[PDB]
Structure formats: structure tokens, C-alpha cells
Design a protein around this ligand. Structure first.
Ligand SMILES: N[C@@H](Cc1c[nH]c2ccccc12)C(=O)O
Ligand SMILES: N[C@@H](Cc1c[nH]c2ccccc12)C(=O)O
Ligand SMILES: N[C@@H](Cc1c[nH]c2ccccc12)C(=O)O
Ligand SMILES: N[C@@H](Cc1c[nH]c2ccccc12)C(=O)O
Ligand SMILES: N[C@@H](Cc1c[nH]c2ccccc12)C(=O)O
Ligand SMILES: N[C@@H](Cc1c[nH]c2ccccc12)C(=O)O
Ligand SMILES: N[C@@H](Cc1c[nH]c2ccccc12)C(=O)O
Ligand SMILES: N[C@@H](Cc1c[nH]c2ccccc12)C(=O)O
Ligand SMILES: N[C@@H](Cc1c[nH]c2ccccc12)C(=O)O
Ligand SMILES: N[C@@H](Cc1c[nH]c2ccccc12)C(=O)O
Ligand SMILES: N[C@@H](Cc1c[nH]c2ccccc12)C(=O)O
Ligand SMILES: N[C@@H](Cc1c[nH]c2ccccc12)C(=O)O
Ligand SMILES: [Zn+2]
Ligand SMILES: [Zn+2]
Ligand SMILES: [Zn+2]
Ligand SMILES: [Zn+2]
Ligand SMILES: [Zn+2]
Ligand SMILES: [Zn+2]
Ligand SMILES: [Zn+2]
Ligand SMILES: [Zn+2]
Ligand SMILES: [Zn+2]
Ligand SMILES: [Zn+2]
Ligand SMILES: [Zn+2]
Ligand SMILES: [Zn+2]
Ligand SMILES: [Zn+2]
Ligand SMILES: [Zn+2]
Ligand SMILES: [Zn+2]
Ligand SMILES: [Zn+2]
Ligand SMILES: [Zn+2]
Ligand SMILES: [Zn+2]
Lengths: 70, 53, 69, 69, 53, 53, 53, 67, 67, 53, 53, 53, 53, 53, 70, 69, 53, 69, 69, 53, 53, 53, 53, 53, 69, 70, 67, 53, 53, 53
């Protein structure tokens, strides 16, 4: 299985799990404050992950820095 | 305080906390206007389980 | 299963999931504003992903930048 | 499963899905305007993809550019 | 306008919009002369489902 | 594309897209399993009105 | 919503949306009370074409 | 499962699918005009692909250009 | 099956296991004090791991340091 | 090669190449499952005419 | 996060979280399968007290 | 434990935790005997909101 | 001409078009002396199918 | 279509496509009314050879 | 599965499919004229491929140039 | 299956096995004195390993040193 | 001495040897306050098996 | 399944398929003349291949040149 | 399945197999004297290996030297 | 090697190596399934002649 | 560690750890399947002696 | 063996291992005849603690 | 000559063509003293099959 | 074919292939009418040896 | 499945197939004369191959030359 | 499966197979004299191999030289 | 499935197959004289191979020469 | 090693190591399935002779 | 001599040839004091098989 | 064969292989008629030791 690393570079970063299946809704949204780190897998229930707010992200494809306004 | 409202809920980015999209109830949050954090469920599930037992 | 990284370089970028199967329509479109990042897998339900608006994209095949306007 | 990346370098690029099976017809044709990007897998239903119009294309075999009519 | 005919249909490259190949009905488009975009199906399927219900 | 199926139909929160409540047809969605969005009616109304006139 | 009914139809200036002129059906709108925008035709034509095929 | 990339360098290039099985006929021929690109997999029905006309081709084995 | 290495660079670091499944709650939080190291796999029950407090972390994707 | 089977035979849209409609033989294709193209008849007629003369 | 389910509920050592002892409901946990921690009661009591007042 | 009852409630200085003033229910605490901290509301409001939804 | 005999058949390299190997019928070509190209089958199969139907 | 009947046959100039000369069958075309092009033979010979083998 | 690339360097190149099984015969022979290219897999029916005439060939083992007299 | 190498750099290092499953408790705690080495796999029963005290550690991810209290 | 108490038991880091967490019995050690080394089990299991047999 | 490339460097090269199984005989021998190339897989029926006459050969193990006369 | 190499650098090195399963005890300890080498796999029965005494050790993760006294 | 089994035996094209035609033994090969080549008889004749003399 | 289970128990060579000989309980080990080592008795004796005194 | 009974117990010098002093039970050893070493307690304490838990 | 004895048989290296190892029949060659080449079997099998048929 | 009967046997010059000399069987060929070449023996010997073993 | 390449550098090279199973005998011995090449797989029937006489040999392990008697 | 190479550098090297299973005993001990080489796999029956005496050893992990006194 | 290459550098080299299973005996010993080469797989019946006499050996682990 | 099982026992060619011929015990090997080599008897005789003397 | 005792047995390193570990029978060698080489079994199995048959 | 009977035994020079001296059993060989070589003992002792264990 495949996972992502997300380090918040500011307070109030959101990691949002989008539901696997026919319908696409947000079943969950974890908050990160500046410096906290979440490591999240894709699952039977999460088939897309949305990040908003400034954060440093590591994926199997390499690093990308989110810039999000909040 | 150790736990804030921001640690329990987060305003739904899609409906900006409204719960409706131009009349019809929002898909993403499912009419709740907020999506709950893991900390939020933790307590809600806990309480809902043991309350009035 | 594969996935893509999409970082919006402007407000109002759309990531549109095209339905797996005989018929091809779009079951969902996620909006991204400047800087938001979506990480989306191909699924039992999404067999194609369309990006419109200025965005930085990472795939298994390497980087590509989608151009808006 | 395999996918391709297609970035249109002009308006009116067509990505055409040719049907898997004994018979070969176009079940679908997605339009891309200048700069839009499509990421399409081969599926139970698409066993060939045709691109027409100027476009930048990424496959597992490397990059190739389609030219405009 | 946000959505054009171009966004719904595309002329079939095989029959050049005709729908017949020297008399016989075209294979690729299946006598339609046009093949539909995802946006096209999205609406057509939506309409066809809910109309007259 | 500018308008998706999500923009037209929303899964009914009561029957979770089923259309029936333990056998009997759902009240909220009216057996449709989906509640139509404003955008949905916009088109459906429009079409139903002008089709075959 | 991206596209509203105002984007598809416009009230006919001649009959002020009525569809009749002192009893007799309106010429300009052709008894429809509303005239269609290019966007309106685009959809209507599209649907009329592909529906039930 | 393998695939080929084919870019036409002239009008009227043909990609011809030869039928999988005991008998070998061509079930289909796609036409490409100068610059069009086809991406075709081998399938339950195509076990060989023939290219005629000037074209640039990419396979798992590397590039080859037809004339 | 994947795992993570977590070394606390301060007292009171928390590694929190988020529950696999439709619902996301935290079943467990391990405390680490300055220098302790935890090595945790993703499991039938943990599908996400949250780290808070200054820590040095090693994943299959490389090093990242939390603050 | 210049002429393919696609150039000779086209699957009948009515019976989806079956040749029967829920048991009874298809009207459109005439139990053939395929409609012959002009190119198809060209050869078939040609051959039928001159063979064993 | 500061408080986890482990902080609220602890599996009952007698029934190994089952809640029954070879059929009959467990004495120690009182059919709960889990023994609530002080933190657990803190909240549960708090809520039970002030909810719907 | 991270959060204790003292973190949520504080004895009402007016009624010394009684809830009544010589018979009649206390004004300041509003018959609760205890006044809520910011942390207290945060939870109570959160729970009250999401419980049984 | 668009299609030549060389586009339909090729002389069998083993029997040099003979069809027999020192008396006995050739294995490779199977007594045909020629092996058919894909273009060859395409037509032969087509004709054999639809002739005298 | 790549190859047409005109590619295979040409009307016999002697009998103007009739096949008979004032009753008696035409010499030049040999009662066929049509004379064959090189392309015509190529196919006919090919087919005649391999059919029913 | 494994395939070969064959580019004819002259007119009348033959790609000959030899039958899979106990018996070895030529079920098929495709003609290539100068410059045409065939891409052919090994199949349930072809377990050997013979090339005759001048042609450029690419296999999983690398390039080899056929020189065949016809 | 995966393992770790643990070399204690002081007396009284603890390698603690945390239980696989819904509940997370310590089923076992091995002591190592200065220089002893433990090689432990993840198992049907151990899904996390905690190290405390100064120790040199080798994983599939590379080396990391635990510091003493 | 070859084997010390340290070689058999280790104090539970969670409950600091107490066996209770603010009243309720500790999860990690399971009310034991200590967790056992391999050497510890080796003897305990050995003894428990053969004692009084 | 494996295969070999054989290019004949003279007329009358033979590629001989030796039968898979308990018994070893040759079910088939293909003739190659100067320059012809055969590409032959190991099969349910061929478990050894013999080359005689001057030929250039490519295998999974690298190139080897068979010498005639 | 994995294995380790252990070369004793002194007399009286112990390689101790810790039991796979819910319970962790040591089913066996092999003695090594200076220079002896043991090559031991992880098994249906050994899920952890403990080394005490001066020894040179090779694992999939690389070399580590256990220190005695 | 100079002579292969292919050089001795050729599969009978009539029975495709079977030796029976829908039950009854094949005429062409004479129940052998294979037709012997000239080389085949050469040896068989030779041997049959001189063996055990 | 200094003492292992191997040091305490040795599998009985007669019953190969079974404890029964084709049904009937083993004589040598006395139904134990294992023979206790001197080290084994050392501890067992020791414990049995001083336990609960 | 690493650990012997001599390592756990030592004969009491006062009663020379007897356990009684001219009839009455020995004070020093407390009727045990043997006094325990630190190693002895270590084990006994350990076992006594964890046995039957 | 095209085929020599060398091309059919090879002396068994184990028994140096003897067929016995100090009295008992050789394992490798199975009392044959020679092992056969592919060319050898090819003929032997061919002959054995068709002789006296 | 690689090997012909001429390669195995040669007509006996003495009896001109007859096998008898004015009634009595020929000495040179030994009633065979044909004498064998080295190639002939090679095969015959080989076969005679290994057949039915 | 694995194969070997054998090129004889003299006349009368023997490639001997040793039988798979409990018993080990030579079911077959192919002769090669100077320059001939054999490509032989290990099979359900051959679990060892013996080469005698001067020959050039290619295996998955690399090249090795057999010397003549 | 995985194997080891053992070359004895003196007379009387022992390669000892330790039994796979719950119990650990030596089912077999092969002797090597100076220069002899044993190539032994791990098996359904051998889950550990002990070498004693001076020997050169090759494993999947690389070379190690045993020094054993006998 | 693995195999070994063994080239004898003297007359009378022995390759000995040790039996797979609970019991270890030698079912077979092949003799090689100077220069002969044997290529032997591990099998359902051989789980160890012993080489005695001067020989050059190639394994998946690299070259080793016996004496 | 200098002597192998192959040196002592050889599989009987008649019964292919079975020891029975379609049920009845094999004649050649005498139900042994294996024929003992001279080396085999050497030892067996030797031992049988001197054992328990 | 070709075969020595060292080629058949090896003294058990664990019990130094004794067969007992401080009284109890040794595990490693299984009371034999020696472990047998492959050469050893080879002969022992051979003999045990064929002796007194 | 590597080892022969001559390698194990040698005829007793005293009794010339008889085993008796004018009736009474031979002293030197001890009634065996044959004396054993070092190699002989090596095997005999080995076997005698391990047989039936
Ligand atoms: N219960 C969620 C937890 C989770 C895993 N990965 C995530 C990514 C984003 C948000 C939540 C998650 C799930 O199993 O899917
Ligand atoms: N429910 C969607 C979520 C999703 C995954 N990838 C996407 C890409 C685009 C839009 C939505 C998605 C699905 O699983 O298919
Ligand atoms: N519904 C289509 C979507 C699709 C996937 N890949 C494509 C390539 C081209 C066009 C459409 C597609 C399918 O599953 O096949
Ligand atoms: N329906 C065809 C489409 C196709 C795949 N590969 C091709 C190559 C050439 C022509 C057509 C095709 C098939 O699936 O097989
Ligand atoms: N019908 C043939 C087509 C083919 C595939 N690969 C080939 C190679 C050579 C000749 C023909 C072919 C087959 O499936 O086998
Ligand atoms: N009918 C043969 C064809 C073949 C494959 N590889 C070969 C090598 C040599 C000779 C023939 C062949 C087979 O499948 O086995
Ligand atoms: N019992 C938990 C232990 C665990 C694994 N990974 C974790 C990460 C964090 C906290 C606990 C864990 C489980 O197996 O899932
Ligand atoms: N009939 C033999 C052919 C063979 C394969 N590999 C070999 C190696 C040596 C000798 C013969 C062979 C088999 O299947 O096994
Ligand atoms: N009996 C334990 C042994 C073990 C394996 N890995 C561990 C890590 C830590 C502590 C103990 C262990 C188990 O199988 O899980
Ligand atoms: N019949 C033996 C042949 C063999 C394989 N590997 C060996 C190694 C040595 C000696 C013989 C062999 C077997 O298959 O097992
Ligand atoms: N009969 C033993 C032979 C063996 C294989 N590998 C070994 C390693 C050491 C000792 C003996 C062996 C077994 O199969 O296990
Ligand atoms: N009987 C033990 C042998 C063993 C393997 N690896 C070990 C490591 C240490 C001690 C013993 C072992 C087992 O298979 O599990
Ligand atoms: Zn919402
Ligand atoms: Zn068309
Ligand atoms: Zn509803
Ligand atoms: Zn009007
Ligand atoms: Zn039809
Ligand atoms: Zn309980
Ligand atoms: Zn009050
Ligand atoms: Zn032919
Ligand atoms: Zn005419
Ligand atoms: Zn505790
Ligand atoms: Zn026939
Ligand atoms: Zn017993
Ligand atoms: Zn006393
Ligand atoms: Zn022999
Ligand atoms: Zn004569
Ligand atoms: Zn027999
Ligand atoms: Zn012992
Ligand atoms: Zn005597």
C-alpha cells in the first residue's frame, strides 16, 4: 500500500480524506498546527487526500510544498 | 485550555460552514457544515456509547 | 494502484474524475484554490483525471504543468 | 495498470478512446483546450487512445509530441 | 457562455460528421456522426434519467 | 469541466442513495435515492419545457 | 451554480413574459413568453439530438 | 500489458491490427494523418500490429522509424 | 508491510494511531520522552499515524523532522 | 494493408452482432449480425459473378 | 492529540473485552467489556449532567 | 489524566455549590451549582451539537 | 493496382512453390505451395462467409 | 472505399455491356459483358485458387 | 508476453509464423515492402518467427540485422 | 517479514513489544545490558517496538540511535 | 549472581510500577505493574507446568 | 518463456528442436540460408535447441557465434 | 525467510532463540566458542534472536559487532 | 542433425494427425495419422529387408 | 540469557515428546513427554519447598 | 549447570541443617534448616509474585 | 557418409562401454554400455513404430 | 532427401541384382542381390542392436 | 526456467543429461563436433548436465570453459 | 531458497545441521578436511547451520571466515 | 531454482549429492576427470552438494575453488 | 565421499525399483526392487559374518 | 585406509562425547554422544536394510 | 569398487583360513579364519555401535 507524509508549516493545516467509492465526500478532516506531522495511507475508505494551508509533503512521487491560504 | 473547538471540528471548505449549496444540502460535509477531527470522533463515540447506560 | 499529485498555481483549479466503465462522464470535480494540493488515486470509479487551470502536477511519468486561461 | 498524460498545446485537442474487444470504434472523445491536461488509463473498455491536434504527451515509453493539422 | 456545443460533441473523424461510409452506416460513431464528451454524457444521462418522472 | 454529476445530483442522506427504507420507498428523496440540486432542476425544467415543441 | 435559468431564457420584451397579446398568442416569442439565449439553444439542440437514441 | 506509441510523419499512415488466434486477418486499420498519434495495446484480439507509411514509433524495445 | 521510525527530540512526544476503517478516531497514543524510539507498522487497525512534539522521523519516503 | 475486415463488415447496431432479437432472427441485418459495406458487396458481387465460369 | 480512546476505555481483564463469561454477562465490567477510566467518567458525568438543560 | 472536572467546572461562589439561595434557585450559576470554564463550554457545545445526528 | 498477388500469397520457402517434398505433400504450407498473408485471409474469409447466402 | 467495381471490371466496348451480338454471345468479352483489369484477375485468380481448400 | 520489432530494408521481406505445438508448420507469412514495420508477439499459436530478406530487427535481446536473399 | 537490530550502548536498555490488534499493550519487555544485541521481527503479535535507553539501531530505513534518560 | 530481578521483570514505563492509572487498572502491564523478560517467562512457564504434578 | 535469436552466416544452417520429455529426439529442423534469421522460443515441446553451421546467436546469456564446416 | 551470520570473537558467546507467538521465552541457546560461526534463520519458532558476548554479526541490514563483558 | 522426425513423418492433412474421421479409421493415412516420407520408406524398407537375416 | 528452556526440559527420546506410546501413557517420561534436567529439579524442588510458607 | 541448589540455599550453621534445637524449632533458619541466598530470594520472590496470575 | 555410428551412440563414460560395474549391470547406461543421441532415438523410435505394421 | 537407398545398398556386380547364379544362390552378395555400404551397416547395426530393448 | 549454452571447441564433445529424481543415470548424451552449439534447459527430466571435451560454456553464473581429455 | 558455501581451511571442519522445529538438536554433522567444499541449503529440516574449525564461508550476506579451534 | 557449476582441475573429482529430507546420506557421486564440467541443480532429492578434489566452482554467491 | 548409495544399490531394470510385477513379487530382484553391487555384498557379507561374535 | 572413524562419526560438541548433561541424556546428539556423517548413514542404512534378508 | 574384502580381512597365516588346528579352534584368528585390518575394525566397530539404536 501507499502513504503520504505531511508536515504543517503553519497553524491550522487540514488533511482531508475524500471517500472511496461512487460518491466523493469528506469523511474526515484532521487538523495540524505548525510543525505537527501526519502519516496517512490510502485505504478502503480514502482514495484521495486534500491538503490546505502551508505544508511540506512527501509522496512516492517526491516532494511538493503546499501553499494554501488557511 | 488543552482542547479547543478547532481540535474537534473544522469548517467544511465546500459550503464555508453553511451546510447547503444554493438550497440543496451539501455533499462533502453531509449537511453538517463541519467535518470532525479524529479527536472529535474519539470523544463523540465515547460519550454516545456510555451515556445513559 | 497509481495516484497523482496536483498543486494549484491559481484559484479555481478543477480536478475532474471521469467515470470508469463503458460510459464516460464526470462523477466529481474537486475545486482547488491557489496553493491547495490534492493527492488522488485511480480507483474502481475513476479511470481518468482531467485538470484545468494553472497547476503543477506530479505523476509516475514525471512532472507536467497544466496551463490555465 | 497503465496511463498516459496529455497536455494540449492548442485549443480543440481530442483524446479518443477506441473500444476494447473484437470491434474497434470510438466510445468517447474528450476535448482539451490550450493547456488543459488529461490523465487517462487503459481500461476494460479502452485498449487504444488516439490524439489529434498539437499536444505534449507522456507515456511509460517517454515523451512524444503530437502536431496540429 | 460557459459550455459550448464543442464541449458536448465532437465531429467523428472517420465519417467527417456524415454518419455513413459510402452508403453504409459508420462504425466508429455508430451512425451518430458525432462522438460525445464526458460533459455531454453527464448532462444527457442526467436528463434521460429524471425527465418525465 | 465546469459542471459535474455531483453538481446535479446529491445522494439522499436519509436512504444513503438506496431509495428504500427497510423495504418501503424513501420519503425524503421520494424513491429517487438522490435529491436534485438547483442546477439540476434548472436544466430539467428547461428541457421538459421546450422539448418536442 | 455556474448556469442559471437567466442564462438560458430571457423574458420576451414584447409580451412581458405573458405569451399572449390581448388574447392572441405572441409573435416574437411564439407563445413561449421567453426567448432563448445562444447558451439555451446549445443545450436544447444537444439534448433534443441525442435523447432516446 | 505492453503498448506501442505511433506518431505519423505523413498523411495516410495506417496502423493495422492483426487478429489474435489460429487465423491471422486484419480486424481493423486506423488511419493517421501527419502528426496524429495513436497509443495501442496488444489485446485479447490484437497480437500483431503493422505500420505502413512514414511514422515515428516507440516500443518497450526502443525507437524505430518506419518509412 | 510499511513502518515508521520515530525518535523523540524532547520529552512528551506523542505517536497517535488513527483507526483503520470508515470512522477515524485514535485508539492509542504512545508517549515518548527525549531520546526514546518507537518503531511502528501500519496495521489492520492503524491506517494513519500522527506525531506531535519535536521528533526525528524516518519513513520509506525519507527523513522528516517534526517540531 | 489497404483493406481491413472493418472495411467489409460493420456490426449491426440493432442486434449488436448477435443476429437474433431475444430468440427470433434479426430483421435489420437479416440474421447476418453484420451489415455489408459497399466495398463488401463490390467484391462479393464481383466474385459471385465470375467464379466457376 | 492529547486524549485517546485508550485514555477513556480499558479492556476488562476478566472478559478480555467480550462482556460475557461462557454465555452469562460479565460481573467485573458489568456487561460493558470495558472499564471506564477516571478521565472517562469525568467527561461522561460532566456531559450527562449538563446536556439538554 | 489531561483534563479533570476542575478543568471544566468551578464551584459557584454565590451558592457555594448548593444551587439554591435559601430555597429559591441560584441566579449566577442558574441552578447548576457550578459555573463553566471556556474549556467546559468548548466540549459541551461540541457534544450538544453533534450528538444523535 | 492497389492489391497484388504478392500481397495475398507468398511462395512457400520450404517447397519452393511445389507443394510436395520429393513425392510426399509438404508440411509447412500443407500441400498449398503458398502461405497466405493476413490481407489474403481477410478477403478469403470475408468471401467464403458471405458467398451464396 | 479503396477498390471499386470500376477497378476490377470495365464495360466491353464491343457489346456495350450486353454480352450478346444481335443474339449470339459476344466474342471479345466471352459473354461476360465486362472485361477484367489486371487488378480484377489478381483477386479472381487468388480467390478461385484458395476457396474451399 | 514478449514481442519483436521488424523493419524491412527492402521490398518483399517475409515474417513467417511457425506453429506452436508438436508439429512445426507455417500458419502465416506476412509480406513487408521497404520501410514497412511489423510488431509481432509470440502467441498461443506462434512459438517461432522466421525473417527472410534484408530487415532491421529489435528483440528483448537487442538488435540484429537480417540480410536474407529475398 | 521485517526485523530490527538493536545494540545496547549502556546497561538496562529495554526493547518493548507492543501488541498487534485493536488494543495496544506491552506483552513483553526484553532487557539488554551494555553491548548485548537483539534481533527482533515484527510478528502476528508485535506490530510496534519501543526502545528506551542508549542504543544503536538498524532498520530497513537505515541507522538511528536512541539516547539514554 | 547469574540472574537478577532485573533479568526477570521490568517496571512498566506507563504506570511507573503502580499498576493503576489514576484509579483504574493499567492497560499496558495489565494491573501487574511489571512486564516480564523472556528469561522470566522461561522459568515461570517451566515452574507453572511442572509444579504439583 | 525464453527465446533465442539465430542469424545464419552461411547457407544451410540448421536449427534443430530437441523434444521436451523423457525421450530426446528431434521433432523439427528449420533450414536457414545466408542471412535469414529465426527467433525461437523454448516450448512445451522444445527443451533444447541445436545449431549447426556458421551462425550468429543471441541469448539471454549474451552472444555466441556457432562455427560451421 | 531471513537469516543471520554470527561469528564469536570470544569463548562462550550465546545465540538465544526467542519463541514466536503470544509468549516470549527462550526455547534454545546455542553456545559458541572463539571463532565458531552459526548461521541461523528466523523460523516458525524463532521470531527474535539475542546475542551476548563479543561477536561479529552479519544481517540483511549490514554488519554489527556485539560487545561482551 | 541432418535428419529430423519431420523428415520421416508428415502429419496427415485429412485427419490432422488423429487417425480417425468422426469415429471410423482414416482412409488417406490408413489409421496411421501420419504419411511416411520417401526418406521414411527408404529406411523402413531397408531395415525390414535385412533385419534378422 | 544464561538459562533456556532447553536447559530445563529435554524431549523424551522414547515418546519423541508425545507422552503416549500408541495410545498408552509413556513409561520413561511418565506421561510428561519431557525429562527434567538437573537444573529443572533444582528449581522445581526449591520452589515447591518454600512456596506458601 | 549454571545454578545449583548450593547457589540458592545454604545449610543453617545454628541447626546444622536439622531445623530443630533439641526438640524445639530453630530460631535462625525458622524451622527451614536452610537459609536463602540473595539469588534464592530473587527467584522465590519472582515466582511467588507471578504464579497463578 | 552423412550419419556415423558416433552420431547415433556414445560409449557410456561410467562403464567404459562394458555394461557392468565389477559384475553388476551398470546404472547410468542401464546395461546398454552406450547412451543414444537425439539422432539415434529419432530413427529408433521411427523404425520401432512403423516396422511390421 | 539426404540419404537414399543408393546410399545404403549397391547392386551386386556378380549377380546383377538377381541373387542366384543360374539357379544356385549367389556367393558374393549371399543371396541378397545387393551389397551394403558402410553407411548401410552403420544403420542396420545400430537398429539391430537397440530395437526391442 | 534455466538454460545453458554449449559451444564445442573440438570434435566429439558430449553433453550428458543426468536424470531428475531419486536415481541419477544418463538418459541422454548429445554429441557436438567442433563449432556446433547446443542450448539446453533444465527440465522435468534433466536436473544436471555434464560436459566433456573442450567446450565454451555460458550459464547464468557466467562463462566457463571445459578442457579436452 | 537460500544456501551457503563452506570451504575448509584445515582438516576436521564440521558443518552441523540444527533441526527445524520446536526442538533444536543436531540431526547431522558433515566432516570436511582441508580444501573440501560443501554447499548446503536451508531445508524443511535444517533451519540453522553451525561451522567449527578454520573455514571460508560465503553467504547471501557476504563472506565470513570461521576460525574455530577444531 | 538454483544451480552450481563445477569444473575439475584434476582427475578424480567427486560431486556428491546429499539427500533431501530428515536423513542425510549420499544417493549419488558423479566422478569428474581433469577439465570435465558438471552443472547441477538442487532438487527434490539433493539439498546439499559436496565437492572433493581440486575444482573450480561457480555459485550464485560467486567463485570458490576447492583443493 | 568415496562410496555412495549408488555404489551399493542399483535399481532393478525389470521392476523399475517397484519390487512387484503387476501385483506378484519380482523375480529378477527377488522382491528387493534393487540389485546389490559387488561392493554391497562385500560389506553385507563382512558384517553379517562378524557381527555379535 | 580409505574410510576412517572420523569419516563416519563426529563427537558431539555439546556433550563432548559423554551422552549425558550433568545426569540427564543429551538433547543435541540424543544420548548417542556422536553425530553421524552422511557417509555414516549411507552405510548404516544400507546394512540395516539388507542384513538378514 | 573402492573397498574390497581384501581391504577388510586377510587369511590367517596360522590356520590357512581354516579356523581350526587339527580339530580345536584356532588361537590367533580366534576361530574366524580371517584377521581384520585396521579398515575392517573401523567399519565393524562403527556398525556394531550404531546398529539397532
Ligand atoms: N479511518 C480512515 C483513516 C485514514 C487513513 N488515511 C487517511 C487519509 C486522510 C484522512 C483519513 C485517513 C481510513 O482508514 O481511511
Ligand atoms: N469517490 C472517488 C474519489 C476520487 C478518487 N480519485 C479521484 C479523482 C478525481 C475526483 C474524485 C476522485 C473515487 O474513489 O473514485
Ligand atoms: N469510461 C472510460 C474512461 C476512460 C479511461 N481511459 C480513457 C481513455 C480515453 C477515453 C476515455 C477513457 C473507461 O473506463 O474506459
Ligand atoms: N478493439 C481493438 C482495439 C485495438 C487494440 N490494439 C489495436 C491495434 C491496432 C488496431 C486496433 C487495436 C482491441 O481491443 O484489440
Ligand atoms: N494470428 C496470429 C498472429 C500473429 C501474432 N504474432 C505473429 C508472429 C508471426 C506471424 C503471425 C503472428 C497469432 O496470434 O499467432
Ligand atoms: N512447433 C514447435 C516450434 C518451435 C519452437 N521453438 C523451436 C525451436 C526449434 C524448432 C522448432 C521450434 C514448438 O512449439 O515447439
Ligand atoms: N495494537 C496496535 C499497535 C500499533 C501499531 N501501529 C501503531 C501506531 C501507533 C500506535 C499504535 C500502533 C496495532 O496493531 O495497530
Ligand atoms: N528430452 C530432454 C531434452 C533435454 C533438455 N535439457 C537437456 C540437457 C541435456 C540432455 C537432454 C536435455 C528433456 O526434456 O529433459
Ligand atoms: N513471542 C514474540 C517474540 C517477539 C518477536 N518480535 C518481538 C519484538 C519485541 C518483543 C518481542 C518480540 C512474538 O512472536 O511476537
Ligand atoms: N537425480 C538427481 C540428480 C542430481 C541433481 N543434483 C545433483 C547433485 C549431485 C549429484 C546428483 C544430482 C536429482 O535430481 O536430485
Ligand atoms: N538431509 C538434510 C541435508 C542438508 C541440507 N542442508 C544441510 C545443512 C547442514 C546439514 C545437513 C543439510 C536436509 O535436507 O536438511
Ligand atoms: N529448532 C529451531 C532452530 C533455530 C533456528 N534459528 C534459531 C536461532 C536461535 C536458536 C535456535 C534456532 C527453529 O527452527 O526455530
Ligand atoms: Zn459542506
Ligand atoms: Zn463516424
Ligand atoms: Zn432519501
Ligand atoms: Zn412574448
Ligand atoms: Zn441488426
Ligand atoms: Zn470483566
Ligand atoms: Zn449557584
Ligand atoms: Zn510447402
Ligand atoms: Zn462483350
Ligand atoms: Zn502499567
Ligand atoms: Zn489421413
Ligand atoms: Zn518418554
Ligand atoms: Zn537451623
Ligand atoms: Zn554404463
Ligand atoms: Zn549377387
Ligand atoms: Zn527386477
Ligand atoms: Zn550430545
Ligand atoms: Zn585362524
Amino acid at each position: 500500500s501507499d502513504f503520504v507524509v505531511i508536515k504543517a508549516l503553519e497553524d491550522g493545516v487540514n488533511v482531508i480524506g475524500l471517500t472511496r467509492g461512487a460518491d466523493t465526500r469528506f469523511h474526515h478532516s484532521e487538523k495540524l498546527d505548525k510543525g505537527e506531522v501526519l502519516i496517512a495511507q490510502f485505504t478502503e475508505h480514502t482514495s484521495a487526500i486534500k491538503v490546505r494551508g502551508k505544508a511540506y509533503i512527501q509522496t512516492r512521487h517526491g516532494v511538493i510544498e503546499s501553499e494554501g491560504k488557511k | 485550555m488543552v482542547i479547543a473547538t478547532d481540535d474537534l471540528e473544522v469548517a467544511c471548505p465546500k459550503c464555508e460552514r453553511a451546510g447547503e449549496i444554493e438550497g440543496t444540502p451539501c455533499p462533502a460535509c453531509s449537511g453538517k457544515g463541519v467535518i470532525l477531527t479524529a479527536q472529535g470522533y474519539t470523544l463523540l463515540d465515547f460519550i454516545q456509547k456510555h451515556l445513559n447506560k
